[PDB]
Ligand binder design. Sequence first.
Ligand SMILES: Nc1nc2c(ncn2[C@@H]2O[C@H](COP(=O)(O)OP(=O)(O)OP(=O)(O)O)[C@@H](O)[C@H]2O)c(=O)[nH]1
Ligand SMILES: [Mg+2]
Lengths: 77, 852, 74, 84, 73, 98, 235
Amino acid sequence: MVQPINLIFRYLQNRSRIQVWLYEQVNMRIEGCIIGFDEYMNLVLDDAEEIHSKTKSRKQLGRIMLKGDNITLLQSV
Amino acid sequence: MEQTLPVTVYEMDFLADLMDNSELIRNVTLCGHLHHGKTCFVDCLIEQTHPEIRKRYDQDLCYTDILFTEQERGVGIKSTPVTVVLPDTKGKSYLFNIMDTPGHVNFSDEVTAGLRISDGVVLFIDAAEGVMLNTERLIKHAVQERLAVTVCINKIDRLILELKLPPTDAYYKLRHIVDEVNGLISMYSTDENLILSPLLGNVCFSSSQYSICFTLGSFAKIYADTFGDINYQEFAKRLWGDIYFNPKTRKFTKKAPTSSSQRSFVEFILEPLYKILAQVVGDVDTSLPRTLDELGIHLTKEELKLNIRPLLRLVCKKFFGEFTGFVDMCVQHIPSPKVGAKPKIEHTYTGGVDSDLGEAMSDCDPDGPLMCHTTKMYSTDDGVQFHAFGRVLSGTIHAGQPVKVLGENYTLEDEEDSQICTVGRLWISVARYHIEVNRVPAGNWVLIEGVDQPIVKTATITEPRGNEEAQIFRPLKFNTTSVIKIAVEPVNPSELPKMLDGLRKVNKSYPSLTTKVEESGEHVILGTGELYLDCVMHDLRKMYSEIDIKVADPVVTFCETVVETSSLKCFAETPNKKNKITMIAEPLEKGLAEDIENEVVQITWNRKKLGEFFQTKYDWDLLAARSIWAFGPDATGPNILVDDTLPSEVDKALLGSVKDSIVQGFQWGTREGPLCDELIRNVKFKILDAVVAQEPLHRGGGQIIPTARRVVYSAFLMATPRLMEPYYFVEVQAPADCVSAVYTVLARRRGHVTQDAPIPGSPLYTIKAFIPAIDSFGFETDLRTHTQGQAFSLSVFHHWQIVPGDPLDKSIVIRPLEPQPAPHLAREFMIKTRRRKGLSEDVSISKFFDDP
Amino acid sequence: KAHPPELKKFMDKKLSLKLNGGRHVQGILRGFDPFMNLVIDECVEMATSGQQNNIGMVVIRGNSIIMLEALERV
Amino acid sequence: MSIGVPIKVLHEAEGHIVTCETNTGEVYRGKLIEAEDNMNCQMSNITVTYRDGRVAQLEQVYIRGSKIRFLILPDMLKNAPMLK
Amino acid sequence: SSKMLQHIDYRMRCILQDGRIFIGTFKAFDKHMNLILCDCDEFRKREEKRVLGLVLLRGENLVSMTVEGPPPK
Amino acid sequence: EMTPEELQKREEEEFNTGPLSVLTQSVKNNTQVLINCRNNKKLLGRVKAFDRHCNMVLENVKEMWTEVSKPVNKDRYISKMFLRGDSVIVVLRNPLIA
Amino acid sequence: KYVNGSTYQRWQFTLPMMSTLYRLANQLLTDLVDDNYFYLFDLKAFFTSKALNMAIPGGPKFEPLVRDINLQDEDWNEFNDINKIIIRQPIRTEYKIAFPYLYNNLPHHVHLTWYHTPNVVFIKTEDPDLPAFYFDPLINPISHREPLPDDDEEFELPEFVEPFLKDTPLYTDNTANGIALLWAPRPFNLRSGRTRRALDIPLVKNWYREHCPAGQPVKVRVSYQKLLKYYVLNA
RNA sequence: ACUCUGGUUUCUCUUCAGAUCGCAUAAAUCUUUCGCACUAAAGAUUUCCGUGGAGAGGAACAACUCUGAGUCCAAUUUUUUGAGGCCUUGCUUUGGCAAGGCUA
Ligand SMILES: Nc1nc2c(ncn2[C@@H]2O[C@H](COP(=O)(O)OP(=O)(O)OP(=O)(O)O)[C@@H](O)[C@H]2O)c(=O)[nH]1
Ligand SMILES: [Mg+2]
């Protein structure tokens, strides 16, 4: 049975197109290429980008350290 | 209510509120062998839940065993219910309806009266004695009454303070006990999902002398409250069973490090328990306070001055605390009774689960149609009024509410065994006090006042003006057979009514008691042994009738069998001279009477499955196997009525016209029997031919029932009739040196020793033997006197065996007051029973014919 | 001392998660931590726009999880 | 010294019908199956009142205890032994 | 922490994070300020009183406790 | 934590080298500090002391908060305050004008 | 430390003292670990036998408590019809003491004896050079032969933890002696007690309370039975 | 982790004690029962040997072990924040509240 940070390690082993949702910010999600996590689910993303739902203007961010206290959901593509 | 109840850890409003939520109720029977720790375990639970009720230092408070004969004999005699509120390991309080049942095997019937109203079983096993006679018998009777079985291996201190086993070898002892119980459950149940292991929580380890009680989870929680970061359930999954601890990798391995490491049970559980008991009993003065400081226990200076056994009980009361492993085990592994309502209704209700009332009884709802079921009658100590005890399976009894009590002979077409009785009072029955309640919802046990009059053994209390299609719960199928027969008369005949009154009362108190009057006006009590009938006779002379009562010598009830087919095909015409019946009687195949009695077959089956059984198992043709009419004196009795009437010679519809009366006469004939008016056994009655009258006022009823009994009797007598002896299976627990003494005691009483096997891990032996029950009177007295008390025997009914004589042998002279030799014992056993019965001096084979 | 949330009842079950910002999600549970972050196979997103969006294996932070409903019978 | 009294009352409420309100205003009434030290409540046979007033029937529910505003327990547990 | 063991069984008023009021008999608390209140009536604003019963209020949503009345008999 | 030692003064190595050192500066420099705090308020004062939760004792504070009318910025002066430190957004040493 | 004071009223003893006093009194004590030895030979058994005008063979004989039913004066009812009675073994005196309500018409002032107490399987330790917890050869051997979790599972025991009394030895040099003191007769199962008069201590009361040994002459046998008679009349 | 009780021994008195007051066991008297009463039983009373508890009084040395009381946590799950800002109505106690939509 999969434990979650093992699948985060498998995500960076896959260097997937990880789209991360936000806590309380349902409009803006962030695409990225995941590289590293830690004990507290802080995530660095190589080519991360903001996607709204009303605007949908994907803004490119570069390699970010999105805090663990802000993420909701790590989907792929 | 508001009665004056003792001080308790909970409060009775919380008990009455846990009564409503029937998910938090555990109806539990504590059953085991004699003196295997059940009453002392209930004492430990009572001392846990009652701070003012404390065991004396040198003498164990029993707190059940509330009868005078129980306190004097030391043997539990009646099941005492105890309703406590016990907290779990997680701290959750569950209502516990606990039936402390007698472990003596003669009082096995009392366990059945607890097994009916229970959803689960805690089988108590002496850790020294291991699995004994009544532990095997209550494994069998617990998995056959469809109950969840858990095990409390009580008296583990005997592994420490008596045998002084090493902790590895006492682990081997406990593992052998758990393996023996697993083998017995796999023997008496095809299912293997009820494997008992302490890893599952099914097995609890205990010492009710010293108030030790732990499962693996509750011992792991002592580590979890001592050391914080450990999760105790995962630890409890590793504590038992060939799992070793690696303290360099800190991990539990199946492979043993160092080849001298111990198992996790020995290292983490048994060696701390040994060190606690060894530091108390050996090193109290020198080194008990530093190990007590290591365990977190501080005792007062007044408390360390105690003697070594009360100090052990106190030290383990402070270490182990409450008995939360028992509650772990009975909550995880004994049903809800919401969950346990459906196997209870499927097994014990006569309508089954598929009825409209069986559905509403499987739901177990307190706002349902009232379907209480009482199995025990508890006399108040004035002796006059009884209180029916049982569980509410649906609805709610109320005090003051009129109610419809259905006796055991109530069928839906015979509605006369019912009676509308006003419920007087309701009690939640703890053992030495009763909590008077206004109502009792479903799933709970209740003492009911006022419903005691219309019932003898077993009641189904329903409500009047509804539940018109309400059937009874099944009567208590007992573990054994009440065989020992004593005649009972008053010393002064003028106080016969008191005795008759008292006889009715012992018929209420003892569930497998049979009080009858024979045709000589002789009052007869049937019991399971001499301790059972000694307590019945004590209650008869002291509790119920305050009069003096002569007892006869104990005798046994015999059965009657045949050994060959009947010589001439016997016949009987009715007093009309129409309706000739023509039967032969032949002996049954070997093991078939055991199959009919142990419900391996039923006439409640269809003809296809019944015929398929008798074809594939006993080499019957399907001609004969589809022609079975009935099953002996009851619906499960050891005789068969077959019709081999061809449809060419007999009209089959005209034969099915009188099938009911021929079946009734056959059942009555096998119930009495022509040798000595005691049950016919292991006889196949083949109706060869049957003339039937054409018009129904000439056949049927008063003509064909006594005619069918006469042809059953004559077909039986023309076959070569034999008497059958009840044989007691005797399990003797002797020392190793007293084994040849047990053989010597048994050799004087026609007993054949089956086995003498060492109790593995104890210095004792078990001699399993087969004594005749007519030769077992004072056998345990002979054995314990001859061995100076070192050997001890429990004898329970096993089978019926043919007496070595021939009962129809007028060649045999019997001087009246002599022990007869074996080859004409049956001739002694037949006529004296016939004299006791008062029948004629001899039965001729031609008494029930029509030619003379 | 962080005990794992008691979810082997819900392993391999079809559950509908509610997430923080009025959000919703559906999928098969595959495991957890003591922090109740859930890993999900066959994840269908199910937004409030009304059209159902399959993903597959996702991971959900346990902070954002309001409720589990086991849609499958446990 | 380690575990508090209200979590003991929450463990005492298992099997009973509790009604738990969560952070998003949704009220869940039904049979509390299991509850942990954190207030993670596995409940069952749940009547749900949402914020609008709609009532749904959700037969197996696991609420994360962080989001629980309060639980209304049965008053039977006013006589529970840890509340003495 | 005797500053609220001083307040056990007093009829207390608990203002919450949404602004709702819990007037209940303060039975128990712990280190996380989870309250057990029995016979608790909720007061919200338009005035109405909503009886609840035994409320296990989680400590996250508790702002302020204050006494309404003395402990009953 | 892999540093379970009793003699823990790493928390003011935190306050000399790390991120919170900005306020030990105003413990020692006695500099005016602008605090953007959670109710869209500004607290300018001078922090006397603080530690790891960023709870600060501030002296002689002007606090700014603006109201809608469409926003006019109001002020109130407070003597001296304890500020719970999760109730901040940002903390600012007020800059070198000269 | 060891007694009350100068009044000599209460003593409290160390278990090595009680062990060596138990060993010094070994000749006066029978080393029974039970009262199963006194089955049909205890006080209740003798009160029963006195009440039934029956004599247990090793036991006392009294005057009849009640006037006996003369079994040549009863007049052949249908109850005592000897042609109905199946005789297998003679119903002994012991059976009417053991089950006084089953085997006696008119059991009056009769005492239900204690039944079995479970057989105390205490292995006396012959060798003190043996461990106190030792698989003695009196113990019958246990012939050897489980939902175990996998070793791949990540359950670790934490550093502070080990078994509860790992530093404590399993047995000490006075552990088997204290276990023997558990099964020692009174007063040796005590470690505290109240002081008794030298009159009040019968050194040989539990000698005639045993069965009289084999091979004894008749005068010592009647002496055992009459010591039992006045023991039972006292009690 | 700081402070105030209570002690223990011995001698005596007083009262209660159906509790094995005694893990021991005497004697007297009366009544009953049978013998025909040391060699005999029952019931009851009494006296002795000599207890436990409580209370009280003396006098010997111990006085704070014991029984009590008064006296190291910012990273999901609670207490070191998803917080704050916009729009419509019902009433405005013209401060604004309640519900919903939002935006972050
Ligand atoms: N050594 C030891 N003896 C025990 C233990 N538990 C009970 N006993 C003793 O064993 C005897 C068993 O008596 P009970 O437990 O009361 O009787 P029971 O087990 O309920 O069986 P029944 O007599 O049929 O009711 C008692 O005399 C207890 O003193 C124990 O854990 N260890
Ligand atoms: Mg019992």
